[PDB]
């Protein structure tokens with residue numbers, strides 16, 4: 160006897176009763192393959208993929224006068240008739256009679272939907288069915304196991320060793336699985352091929368001049384030099400048994416990556432250049448230019464590559480292969496091996512005479528960067544001033560205040576910096592005084608103090624006092640010189656105000672104020688309801704008199720839909736977002752959930768395009784360009800939005816966009832398979848269920864551009880049924896109205912609405928640069944957009960709300 164027990168706690172249950180085991184014969188597999196080819200999502204799949212889906216189909220036995228489907232109840236199965244007959248009845252009235260070969264319940268595989276008509280067995284028959292969960296999981300596995308198999312083979316190949324993880328994953332998607340039956344030539348000797356083949360499963364025989372050299376098993380490959388150069392095949396490879404080979408073509412590689420020698424050399428040179436502290440601060444575009452214009456030469460052993468007289472404008476040297484011994488006059492100062500480099504002093508001092516001497520120890524391959532190579536890269540002959548200008552640029556470009564300014568405004572601010580020295584113990588800043596300067600440490604260390612208590616230390620390239628440029632508030636902490644004679648680059652408020660203009664200054668002024676206000680729930684007074692779904696309310700902060708927007712996500716709504724973990728990941732995405740065209744979060748409360756954000760008063764983008772009607776080229780460029788930068792920012796942070804549409808975009812008082820709904824957004828790490836988003840704006844790869852990445856938002860971008868230029872949606876405008884919207888997205892024809900007279904608009908819209916993500920614009924190694932450099936944006940200034948220097952299409956007269 161103890162004083163201290165706990166109790167324990169639709170369509171699937173109905174089909175479970177009719178289920179029965181049966182051996183999958185050859186005659187049964189043939190009719191499944193035939194009917195699945197007529198299906199909407201299995202048409203794109205190959206025979207090996209359809210053969211796997213045929214094995215997971217379960218056999219169901221029915222009797223004459225038995226209910227199969229119910230009208231209004233959720234749809235989870237898709238059936239293929241084997242024997243007997245099934246009459247379709249709609250609203251208690253007959254419609255059609257089916258037989259062997261036909262199928263029904265196609266929409267259930269893509270998404271959960273209520274059926275329209277009932278299906279009853281008229282005669283004694285049997286069905287071949289498959290569930291949504293089982294079907295979608297099999298597509299996910301076929302796609303995931305194929306990509307992981309292909310990626311493992313891309314790693315085993317030696318020509319792709321210097322490619323990055325992102326570059327390796329892109330060429331894995333370009334793989335095409337080519338099947339070869341016994342006694343079928345894969346490649347012939349003498350032919351000029353452009354394909355790389357790897358054995359996934361099976362055996363193949365080699366034949367140089369019709370003589371057997373060896374036998375190739377799984378893992379072996381051939382055609383590395385075919386992807387690089389136009390050379391003939393050294394042997395004739397023939398299949399001994401039924402082989403399957405993963406094939407990468409040079410034509411598809413040029414679309415995804417471009418010239419492979421250029422991409423590999425850019426990675427080699429970037430890795431070699433990033434070892435030096437000078438080129439560590441250079442941008443990726445600048446480092447690629449140096450690699451594209453570097454002089455690569457081969458030298459024998461014991462050869463003076465560079466001598467005091469025979470320099471020929473060389474400022475930097477990188478060893479690609481072999482070894483070189485560095486010398487100063489007649490004294491050795493080091494030995495550089497593969498990857499190592501030299502020249503930092505000559506790169507920094509353009510006019511300095513070359514005193515060192517480089518001599519090869521063995522046969523080597525050396526890359527050389529001259530002064531003209533550095534001048535064309537930096538875009539100015541004064542290399543010493545440009546490197547110092549880039550060093551300052553690299554520091555200020557990492558800060559929100561100067562990141563989004565135009566390059567002209569950014570260069571004037573960099574040119575306006577002045578250096579000043581501070582002795583030991585000198586107060587740069589004193590807490591309580593109203594400062595008017597922003598500082599960047601050039602050389603030395605400085606201690607941060609408040610009430611005689613050391614909070615932290617700042618060294619070379621660190622910065623402080625950026626708030627003084629936007630306000631006339633007193634300094635919070637004092638900055639004392641810890642080290643001797645510390646140098647500091649500084650810019651006055653007067654100078655900053657002359658460069659920056661009204662719109663951007665207003666955006667920075669009221670945005671940076673939000674981080675200082677300490678907000679608790681008790682002082683937020685509710686003015687009015689602005690949104691509804693889950694509800695958004697306009698709130699007034701009584702102490703600071705600043706107006707904000709407050710979301711109210713109900714806990715019962717999250718628990719009912721089973722979004723306990725997804726709401727936690729939404730908080731992580733929304734809080735980390737810090738971009739001028741994305742909503743800025745202040746603080747999140749809980750007890751139901753809440754999200755306090757900035758108040759966006761200019762109205763909705765949905766209503767803005769209705770007020771303007773069909774947008775023109777300057778108006779469509781502005782809104783799509785504003786969306787591109789917000790989506791590019793999320794793609795750079797490995798976040799996929801999955802729900803891009805004008806309904807989830809608001810306009811601010813200045814007329815600039817603001818992205819807001821991050822419910823469907825997710826931090827991607829590989830390939831996502833969950834079907835989410837709005838049907839009209841969803842991409843085909845989401846519907847097909849064979850994996851998708853950040854490329855889905857570039858499809859929705861094309862759908863937005865289509866609405867702006869043309870008016871209606873490109874796929875299923877009048878259609879309300881999800882199946883018919885999804886059918887128009889996959890099998891439908893993309894057409895354009897007769898009033899659209901611009902070629903560049905149509906060319907961009909067609910390239911953005913390209914079903915295959917490999918061939919879609921902006922889904923290559925270059926990324927959004929391909930969309931940004933398109934003929935549609937020829938006259939568009941991307942610097943002036945982010946810096947709030949363009950006149951927007953529509954400006955709100957006062958405030959607007961839904």
Ligand SMILES: CN(C)Cc1ccn2c(-c3ccnc(N)n3)c(-c3ccc(F)cc3)nc2c1
Nearest residue numbers: 690695708709710754756757758759806819961
């Ligand atoms: C879909 N729309 C037609 C309805 C609508 C309208 C405004 N918001 C906001 C909104 C945002 C800013 N300013 C303001 N004023 N409204 C937000 C929002 C989103 C996330 C948050 F954490 C806080 C607020 N959501 C909506 C939805």
